[PDB]
Design a protein around this nucleic acid. Structure first.
Length: 18
RNA sequence: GGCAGAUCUGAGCCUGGGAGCUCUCUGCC
């Protein structure tokens, strides 16, 4: 799946297989 | 060169509730 992180008030995600 | 983590309280942009990219810091090879 995608790994999210809180950046710029919004949550940025990173494609991670699952 | 690659990977991971962090954020307007490290920083910026686009879309539009996320998904990408660059930069910075840290760590690893």
């Amino acid at each position: 799946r995608v790994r999210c992180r809180q950046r710029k008030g919004r949550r940025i995600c990173i494609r991670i297989x699952p």
